[PDB]
């Protein structure tokens, strides 16, 4: 299988602030009403984060494009989504993403998830496209178009539909599915968090914590990754997914990580409620020097 799309209308990306998001529990240790200092990979506050809003805009030839370039992985990636109709499905993490090295794949199917490390032969423009059309009976259909061949599938794991599904009550457009991916010592750790919002698109200034979800013992090398978009096939033309189609206005944000020292405040139950970045500014340096969120007058010593 392989499909080409023309869709070469280009445009530069856009930048925003991370403000104060991107804090996750570093260990399985529980504490109560204490302040803890730690050193680990994090997202520095008020950062330089990319925003990939590059697809067709609702109008006359409104800059149609496929929004999925490959990006470097480095040490850690923070992935943020604001999307309601389930346009993004999964991801591919690898080094050469070819028929010469292994590559981990994550894909959701509106039910329990599919996870595997294997050796696939990805297409030029990876995607999976589905459509609901009554052909033999009304309202079914799953599809598959991601790759052409797959050899040496050395692991399999089907547990749950991820926290992407299973919304609660009231609320509704949560649209803050935040994920952090780490690869340490042959272990692929994934964190997740969901939080309701009240705005069409912006990162709110509130504070939230990210829980550990899974730690897969894979042990493969990742240097680049790519997202997977659930293409919608408007099956009114004989050119299938290689022809005219229409979808929404999905977009996402990607941020990177660097080693930092952070101060964390645990409440009386064991949930992080406020963090302080050590390397921000003189106030932050002083507040990291002595364990306190408030400081009195005088003159203090720093690095």
């Amino acid at each position, epitope marked *: 299988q392989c499909v080409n799309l023309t869709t070469r209308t280009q445009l530069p990306p856009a930048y925003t602030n991370s403000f104060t998001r991107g804090v996750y529990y570093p260990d399985k240790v529980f504490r109560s009403s204490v302040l803890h200092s730690t050193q680990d990979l994090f997202l520095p506050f008020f950062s330089n984060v990319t925003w990939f809003h590059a697809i067709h805009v*609702s*109008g006359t030839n409104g800059t149609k494009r496929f929004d999925n370039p490959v990006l470097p992985f480095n040490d850690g990636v923070y992935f943020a989504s604001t999307e*309601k109709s389930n346009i993004i499905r999964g991801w591919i993490f690898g080094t050469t993403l070819d028929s010469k090295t292994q590559s981990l794949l994550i894909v959701n199917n509106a039910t329990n998830v599919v996870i595997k490390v294997c050796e696939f032969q990805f297409c030029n423009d990876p995607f999976l496209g589905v459509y609901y059309h009554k052909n033999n009976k009304s*309202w079914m259909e799953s599809e598959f178009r991601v790759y052409s061949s797959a050899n040496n599938c050395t692991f399999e794991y089907v547990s749950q539909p991820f926290l992407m599904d299973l919304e609660g009550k009231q*609320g509704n457009f949560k649209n803050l599915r935040e994920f952090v991916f780490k690869n340490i010592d042959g272990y692929f750790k994934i964190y997740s968090k969901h939080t309701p919002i009240n705005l069409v698109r912006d990162l709110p200034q509130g504070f939230s914590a990210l829980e550990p979800l899974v730690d897969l013992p894979i042990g493969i090398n990742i240097t680049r990754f790519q997202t997977l978009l659930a293409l919608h096939r408007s099956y*009114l033309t004989p050119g299938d997914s290689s022809s005219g189609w229409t979808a*929404g206005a999905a977009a996402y944000y990607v941020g990177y990580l660097q080693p930092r020292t952070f101060l964390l405040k645990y409440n009386e139950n064991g949930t992080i409620t406020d963090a302080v970045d050590c390397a921000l500014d003189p106030l932050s340096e002083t507040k990291c020097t002595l364990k306190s969120f408030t400081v009195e007058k005088g003159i203090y010593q720093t690095s």
Partner: antibody
Amino acid sequence: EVQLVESGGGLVKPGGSLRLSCAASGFSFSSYSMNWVRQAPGKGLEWVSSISSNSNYIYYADSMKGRFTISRDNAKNSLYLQMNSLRAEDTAVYYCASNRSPYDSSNYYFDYWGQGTRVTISS
Amino acid sequence: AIRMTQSPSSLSASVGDRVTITCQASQDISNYLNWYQQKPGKAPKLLIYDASNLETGVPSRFSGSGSGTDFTFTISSLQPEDIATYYCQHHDSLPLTFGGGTKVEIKR
């Protein structure tokens, strides 16, 4: 072939109770979710209630809160509504409609419609 | 609830004429609007979802555009089977609320 067999219309005295029912035949009724919408003569369409898929989340209209009971039965693939109304204007035509998401992608828009049942509240 | 303004309430134009229906909301809701078509004496039918997506089995002569709080419903060329009623409806967090509705006609 998707059939929505509906029944339960009629004329009653104010404060009466009725039993609306529509059975879906020809598809996975349990997998998808239904929805309700009513139309007064010469008026637009307004949502009434919802049952989702596993009946885990139930939504009722604010104007008709605590008045209608909605249920479904996958054993014989039907949808029931105990309609208890104390107001005359509820005289209208009802429609049970089907969605397009597998179970619940993101809230409920309409994909299929029935024929509509007539309900009259008058002396 | 968010207010829907539909313009025009009703317009009349001969066949083969571009028809524009403007639906405006009182709150920024991005692309979460749906267009429903109802023929006389018949149950309503869905035409456009996400305010810009054409479904399967819907004639290609119909289209839609717009985003934010303003949306346009476009008929490139009228044909003698498009006489019906059209409705625009948001889809965010409120259970449901339909607009006033627009009925189209032909000047001949």
